[PDB]
Design a protein around this ligand. Structure first.
Ligand code: NI
Ligand code: NI
Ligand code: NI
Ligand SMILES: [Zn+2]
Length: 137
């Protein structure tokens, strides 16, 4: 895969729900490889031209994929999160993020997963889910 250029339309598009049970194993492998090759800690389908709701992460309290990730709970208010993005090399933005989130979805074997995250990992998750909605820093 390739990390799309900062002017790619896919970055602003909405990624489609993955049909339940669809074989995503190779896609996740490719996405993980793209993320690590670029020295990232997270990556979303849109960033590699895959308009499917798949994220991959290598964050302090979560490493792996989430298929159809959703935020089911979060803290009120916002906190400071300085973030870069593999799609925007050289740019750091001070984002407002929820300090804690719970993210739910499916793993590559279509087992339901739940991720309770705070701080950096919570920011990671919110940033990647944003990508799937065409939202960038
Ligand atoms: Ni490649
Ligand atoms: Ni743009
Ligand atoms: Ni809410
Ligand atoms: Zn990003």
């Amino acid at each position: 895969m390739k990390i799309l250029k900062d002017d790619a339309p896919e970055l602003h598009a909405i990624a489609a729900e993955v049909p339940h049970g669809e074989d995503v194993k190779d896609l996740v492998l490719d996405m993980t490889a793209a993320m690590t090759a670029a020295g990232g800690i997270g990556l979303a389908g849109n960033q590699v031209g895959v308009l499917k709701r798949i994220i991959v992460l290598r964050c302090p309290t979560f490493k792996g994929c989430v298929i159809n990730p959703i935020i089911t709970r979060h803290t009120d208010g916002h906190v400071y999160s300085p973030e870069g993005c593999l799609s925007y090399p050289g740019k750091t933005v001070a984002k407002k993020r929820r300090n804690k989130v719970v993210v739910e979805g499916y793993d590559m074997d279509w087992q339901p997963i739940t991720i309770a995250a705070k701080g950096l990992t919570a920011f990671c998750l919110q940033h990647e889910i944003d990508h799937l909605n065409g939202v960038t820093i």
